[PDB]
Amino acid sequence: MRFDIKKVLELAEKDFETAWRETRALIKDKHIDNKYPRLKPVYGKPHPVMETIERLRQAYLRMGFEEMINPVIVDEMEIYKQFGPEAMAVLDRCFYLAGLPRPDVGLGNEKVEIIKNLGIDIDEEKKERLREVLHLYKKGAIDGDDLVFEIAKALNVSNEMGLKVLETAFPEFKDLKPESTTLTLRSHMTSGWFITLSSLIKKRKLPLKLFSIDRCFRREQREDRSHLMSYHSASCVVVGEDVSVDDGKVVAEGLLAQFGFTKFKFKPDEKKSKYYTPETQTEVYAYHPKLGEWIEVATFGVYSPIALAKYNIDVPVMNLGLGVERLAMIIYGYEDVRAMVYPQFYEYRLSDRDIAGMIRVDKVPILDEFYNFANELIDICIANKDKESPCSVEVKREFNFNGERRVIKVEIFENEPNKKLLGPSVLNEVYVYDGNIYGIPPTFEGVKEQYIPILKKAKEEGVSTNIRYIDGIIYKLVAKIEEALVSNVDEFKFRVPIVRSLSDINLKIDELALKQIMGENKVIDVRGPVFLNAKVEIK
Amino acid sequence: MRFDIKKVLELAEKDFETAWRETRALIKDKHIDNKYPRLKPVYGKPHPVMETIERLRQAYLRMGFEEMINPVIVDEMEIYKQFGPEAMAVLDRCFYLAGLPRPDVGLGNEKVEIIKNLGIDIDEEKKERLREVLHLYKKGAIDGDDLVFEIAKALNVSNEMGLKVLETAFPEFKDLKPESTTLTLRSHMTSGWFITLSSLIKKRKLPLKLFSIDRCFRREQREDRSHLMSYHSASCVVVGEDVSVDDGKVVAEGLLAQFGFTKFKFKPDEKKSKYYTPETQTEVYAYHPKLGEWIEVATFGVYSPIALAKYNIDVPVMNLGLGVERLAMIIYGYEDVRAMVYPQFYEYRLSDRDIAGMIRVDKVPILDEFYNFANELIDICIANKDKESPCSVEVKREFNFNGERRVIKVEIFENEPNKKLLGPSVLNEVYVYDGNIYGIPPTFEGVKEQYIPILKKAKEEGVSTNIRYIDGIIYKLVAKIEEALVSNVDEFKFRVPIVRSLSDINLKIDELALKQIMGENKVIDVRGPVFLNAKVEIK
Amino acid sequence: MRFDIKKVLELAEKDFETAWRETRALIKDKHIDNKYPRLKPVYGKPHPVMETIERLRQAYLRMGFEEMINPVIVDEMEIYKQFGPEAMAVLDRCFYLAGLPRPDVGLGNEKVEIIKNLGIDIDEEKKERLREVLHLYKKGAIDGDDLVFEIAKALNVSNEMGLKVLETAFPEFKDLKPESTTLTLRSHMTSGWFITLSSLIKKRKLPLKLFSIDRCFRREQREDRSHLMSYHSASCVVVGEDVSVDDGKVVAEGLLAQFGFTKFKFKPDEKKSKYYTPETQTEVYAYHPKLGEWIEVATFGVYSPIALAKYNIDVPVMNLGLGVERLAMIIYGYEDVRAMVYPQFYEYRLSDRDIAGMIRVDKVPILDEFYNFANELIDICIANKDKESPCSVEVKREFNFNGERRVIKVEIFENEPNKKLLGPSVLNEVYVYDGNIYGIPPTFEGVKEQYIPILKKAKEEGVSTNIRYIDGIIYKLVAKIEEALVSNVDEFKFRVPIVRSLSDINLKIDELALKQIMGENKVIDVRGPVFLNAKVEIK
Ligand SMILES: Nc1ncnc2c1ncn2[C@@H]1O[C@H](COP(=O)(O)OP(=O)(O)OP(=O)(O)O)[C@@H](O)[C@H]1O
Ligand SMILES: Nc1ncnc2c1ncn2[C@@H]1O[C@H](COP(=O)(O)OP(=O)(O)OP(=O)(O)O)[C@@H](O)[C@H]1O
Ligand SMILES: Nc1ncnc2c1ncn2[C@@H]1O[C@H](COP(=O)(O)OP(=O)(O)OP(=O)(O)O)[C@@H](O)[C@H]1O
């Protein structure tokens, strides 16, 4: 359990130094299962696009901007107001919203028969209750969520039978086709900004500095290295009598400065979109190092007095919109938005450490007694690994299991002469380097010489499992002692000659790590002569 | 400018205390324009829904959850996979995505004539360049953004003439009607979670704890006190062999605990939506104090082995989705999501302080010389406000304007006997309380007695402008001296008898504050006898 | 073992509804150990003072202020520079810094003797090596950290014996007494601001807005509800040719506004500390609702031209310092800073939920087989609890343990007439309410009527363990079957007459929760007649 405070204090007062040294034994090492690097840290991991969104919220807030949420869904005529006649072309880029009608369907008599053939007992009453539920669904008074519930309730059947009725008796529901409206999703924040400002200016003291960082949707040819069907705009508007394009320049500098950028460039936007005053629509470029090229991070301009007029705004307004995903690409060094935004549809490679922590000890003794017995036994072997043969090393110990004592005589030996007790590889340690697994000896005596610079490099740069051959071997041995005791076996022999695989030293690897090791076509080279012979007797 | 370090140090070393007291004069008070409360703080203001989103990101991250972004747009068949046959009803709630076709239109000859009648010179070459631009637009190779540019480029005309051509020659663009697809917007995070997990499970080590806080869209009957067409889901999934509904209970407790909630309640969801294992769909309620009632903050459950199977997932998965806007309503005490999310479409009331800072001094002298002259003059009047009449107070001072000196004799007097120099109201101070503006005297001597408890309360609880009648009056007087000097006027009289309005003491109020003061039907009661007579001579 | 995707898809495709209902069995319930509320959420918990510090950094950053770190340690003469002669009094509140000298000690034969008697073999060489280590320590070239190491290294002894030599041969090290210096810890940020500003003004463009939120130290008579020896100042300075107190007023308003405060008060500071221009030192008050009284959150003023002059600053400077702990007290509703700041030295009460999650099931079967057997058995009893006596319920089941079959006949009975199989309390459920534990029946027939409103209240407001008597009872029974099999026992009887304690239904409570249950003088009332007789035979 825990340790004796009194005994520790007394031992320490007799002689502090001995006590400090000796008292280390009161601190147990962890179960082999849970030693580093098999012990992994757990922490929450943010998404780059969303951390960039928060950092942008704060870059705007720290410039005095007031945070807003604008309408997402806007009528097409809003886009005609802002873009003018150009909207008959620009509206190609916007998603229209469409939706299913309600079905007008009735009950009886063929349907009544279907429902009866389902095993349902229907009154006239039940038939009317359901006739009403269907009416209400036609008239829009019941949600789709709720229709299985209401049917079930109507006929007094199970929920699932409600669904059964729905799909069996009324399959014409499947013939509903979505019909489009005049409503669209905003393709940039502006489509909302006008609506928000039109209502807001008259109520507020100018100048206004507003911002919103929120989703926008474009209907594009395809998705790109730098384009998605849905993106995030880090948009703002500055409203005031004296506003000009320079305000956009200053907002772009202030946003980018806070992210570390010292160099960006402005460049006229050939499009000259009509919601912007002529010759004010400006592109902002920042440098993407991994791509080598300059990338468009933002766009700004001053709204056209014509659009502003159509929204009852009589004062100039500067707009700036920065694409969150672009900035994020630069920040985190991604070269493909699709792979940055949705990394789940791509691959998750395991590092040397990841793999080193997926290498586990197979059989280990379950009982504390024998686990410690194992550790001690390991240290014993490591102490006599060089005994000159013929050798033997006995360990007799008594274990008490309630009433009965059993005495375990584990003996590990070497009959044949001119040998040593254990062999050149018993202390080999399993490393992982560059996707490879190597069981490496502490010194390269007798190692083939092409191999040595590789193993030296893995031993230097790679990640260790901190498991030696001897460790897994002995845990296997003592686990076999436990196994023996519950199996009514009094004697057995156990031997590890030349080690050829992970299995041979009682280790295994998580299948996910194997799949990669193979897939990347790398090696698991665990090998060595480890001639360990043991006999155990259980009296 | 700035002050003399040497002179200050010397004055201080002669006698520290006198020096510390006297040296206060080296610190100028601010221009009356910029004194508190006319001086307002400026800081960025977060939006409650977005601060709640960040706090939720961190509540999830602090539980070890991994942040994700899921597809927003999903095919309808995804919903059939998750919801089963019920999707023929549930899909009513989802928005379908629709979009405009490209137009197939050609050039010539009537269009060629329109273009010519526009003032454009068209070659055969220009005609072919544009015929190609229109082809490419048909074939989807030119964006809507870019079409005015390309037309303009084709015909070598101005940008705007490009647009002119577009809308005049090809108005059939306006006849494009949006045609619907099979693509929908997700109505809750699950519709994305399945897609994400289906691809992600095989690549990753279980258990997984994922989360995303992102927009969802529902097609509802109407928007409510608690329902919007677009909302934010604070969703998560826990994936593992041993996952059960209890995981949802623990996620809901852990999310709500971090926000301060000590009391929430669970309740079965009658819907029993089919993407959830039977009898696991659970509602989470938390208490909204301003509304008095319990409100639904979240929903969770365990996905159905049938849906999981249709996505190649063979291990149970718990889903929880919390509505950000609901939680926000509880947190910030709003009772109407529409008013919380989009407060720009509602009203912005001005506090007592807001109004007190929108009360400005009208005329003030522009020249430093005369501004200080004014301040001194004010203090002079405040010193002789009780001189027994007949009174007079002269102030002769010489001002130098490059070459020429002028000597200003400002005299403020009181001819008639049994009076005092100034009158009972000269030190009245303008306060704002409960939407009202009151000019209040320092003591209630002679004040009508119904009024006294009101004015006492305004003076106690209200916000002061820190402007007294005498202040605005004298700034007006000296401003008139300046005015005089540039107007070639050597003499004038200036008098303030009984004060009746803000104007009478040289103040005015920002129109936005007036509009409210009137709208709320409150008063501006600035009144008092302040009999100040002055003559000024400029020699 | 996960579930069969193919079998599921096929079952679902035969009949979706049956399959949806039936596949619930593929979602295994959690081990009783890990069911809610024993399953707790785990998340990181911020400290109120530090969370307030961060929110304050952001309130300052959002006003355009530039964040700084100022010297913490400052010479006393700095304080004389700022405070003038008043510093001969003010310096009482400041901590002086002191430190102990290096010892001058030599070796020589009396010590050499001690070291030998310690068991250490000392050469002349070792003696000289250690003589140098002691020299270098006198001359300041060895850190205290490092001295035990160096000593050991010198004598070629263990680390611990290096320490032994140190404490045994040179115990005069203990006679070192701390000598004070002229260095002090800052008692407010100002003591650093001057230093910082003195260096910074010449290098920068005015106006400057700086802020720092960092520790300050005071020597107070004692610590208060509102005073600690060390506190955090959220300080700032505004530097510019035109600053006055009004800048302090807007900074205080802007700081407090962002925290939700609409209400604060200014009040002259009687002290008129000499580092502030006369009559500018201002106190800021905010309302602490729980304390009922107004509390001092901040102080501001304009530095004295004398102090600024002694630092070569020729331009006015407004300083404001808000005490973080005060603001935190208001925000989180603490009434005692010492208890808010250092809550570990105070008490941690367990909520009802906390205690309900510390009630554990004692004995539960280890083998999956018998665990499920147990659940099945529970449901069987719950199904036959009302069988009229004489009753019996047999459950014969055969279990396979590698080679051998064993057949377990569990028989649950009631021989005596006029009774039922189980008894009125068998389905009682354990609740926690207001610090009490109650085992409560689903219905109140036969309950003494004094008790009923209490138990009704606990059942409504309290927190359930979601464990019924029958649950723990049967888990105990089957656990005993397991014990039997391992113990070579083929028959036993098992009976639960009247329930009197938690132990009687195989439950126990965590020691920490009991300590409180007792300390707070509350009850653990679980009792009921639950007459369950069972016989078990193992063939
Ligand atoms: N599909 C998209 N994905 C991500 N970000 C986008 C997308 N479309 C536009 N943006 C962002 O919005 C801003 C304005 O878009 P704009 O159309 O002006 O330039 P573009 O990159 O040529 O886009 P398009 O392909 O629509 O012409 C850009 O700075 C970019 O940051
Ligand atoms: N229109 C909406 N606006 C805001 N939040 C919503 C909206 N619809 C659903 N939510 C959130 O998603 C969760 C699940 O919605 P669910 O449909 O299960 O319940 P509901 O409130 O009855 O919605 P509905 O009206 O669609 O039936 C709720 O906790 C709520 O937080
Ligand atoms: N010991 C302290 N603990 C916590 N905060 C303090 C302490 N001393 C001062 N503060 C903070 O610093 C500001 C200035 O302190 P000041 O000494 O002017 O007032 P005070 O509360 O009377 O302090 P004291 O009584 O220690 O002189 C206060 O607003 C308070 O917020």
Residue numbers in the entry:
A (entry chain A), B (entry chain A), C (entry chain B): 11 to 549
Please quote the paper that reports this structure.
More recently, it was reported that a third protein SepCysE (SepRS/SepCysS pathway enhancer) is necessary for coupling the consecutive two reactions and for enhancing tRNACys binding. Thus, the SepRS, SepCysE, and SepCysS ternary complex (named the transsulfursome) is responsible for the whole process. In the present study, the structures of the binary complex of SepRS and SepCysE, and the ternary complex of SepCysE, SepCysS, and tRNACys from Methanocaldococcus jannaschii have been solved. On the basis of these results, we propose the scheme of the tRNA-dependent cysteine biosynthesis by the indirect pathway, where multidomain SepCysE binds SepRS and SepCysS to assemble into a functional unit (transsulfursome) and mediates the transfer of tRNA substrate between the active sites of SepRS and SepCysS via flexible linkers.
During the study of the quaternary complex SepRS-SepCysE-SepCysS-tRNACys, we serendipitously obtained the crystal of the ternary complex SepRS-SepCysE-SepCysS. In the electron density map, whole SepRS and the N-terminal helix (Met1–Lys24) of SepCysE(N-helix) were visible. However, the remaining components of SepCysE and SepCysS were disordered in the crystal, although there was enough space in the unit cell to accommodate the entire complex. SepRS was organized as a tetramer with 222 local symmetry (one of the two-fold axes is crystallographic), as previously observed. A pair of N-terminal helices (N-helices) of the dimeric SepCysE wound around each other to form a coiled-coil structure and were tightly bound to the SepRS with their two-fold axes aligned. Most of these residues (Leu9, Ile10, and Ile17) plus Ile14 were clustered with the hydrophobic residues in three pairs of loops ((loop 1: 376–380 ILDEF), (loop 2: 411–414 FNGE), and (loop 3: 494–498 ALVSN)) locating at the interface of two anticodon domains of the SepRS dimer and contributed to the formation of the complex together with some hydrogen bonds. Whereas deletion mutants of each of the three loops of SepRS showed no significant effect on binding, the double-loop deletion mutants did not bind SepCysE, suggesting these loops together contribute to the interaction with SepCysE. Likewise, N-helix deletion mutant SepCysE(ΔN-helix) completely lost the ability to bind SepRS. This structural and mutational evidence suggested that the SepCysE dimer tightly binds to the SepRS dimer by inserting its coiled-coil N-terminal helices into the interface of the SepRS dimer, which reinforces the stable architecture of transsulfursome. ATP was observed in the active sites of SepRS.
